[PDB]
Design a protein around this ligand. Sequence first.
Ligand SMILES: Cc1cc2nc3c(=O)[nH]c(=O)nc-3n(C[C@H](O)[C@H](O)[C@H](O)COP(=O)(O)O)c2cc1C
Length: 148
Amino acid sequence: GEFMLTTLIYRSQVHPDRPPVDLDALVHRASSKNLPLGITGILLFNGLQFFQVLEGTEEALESLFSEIQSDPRHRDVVELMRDYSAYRRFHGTGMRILDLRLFETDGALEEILRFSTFGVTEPVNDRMFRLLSAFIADGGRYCLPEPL
Ligand SMILES: Cc1cc2nc3c(=O)[nH]c(=O)nc-3n(C[C@H](O)[C@H](O)[C@H](O)COP(=O)(O)O)c2cc1C
């Protein structure tokens, strides 16, 4: 049957001691799976963590995200979100990592936008964007506000 959409989002880590990730091959094998699965989204990397924006059938988001925590690469993958939806923000891009090590807060965020075609109501109070920009902004444990 035809079931409504959903947006699951999660974030993990990586090997702080071992070498970098194959963020080219890592996302490639992912898109190939999510595409036919009907899933869509974007991945991120800051040299320590992985942020993924999954948007598709809830039944797929769970299993997928479950396949993720079963991976040996990262480690602390935790469900950041999971909200009901009726539309797809990323139309055409099944999976696409974002080596933030290349961009920055406003930079990386721009990346998403340029290929996100986000035309929803408003990315403002967007539950997903909350996390998305939080990873782009803080990338894990901030230190800008409240000094010593
Ligand atoms: C950090 C990380 C994130 C992943 N994210 C996804 C994902 O969002 N969707 C997906 O279908 N597979 C995902 N995968 C799984 C890979 O796409 C792929 O299955 C893996 O690189 C090895 O596949 P193989 O055992 O079939 O060779 C992820 C793997 C890693 C290490």
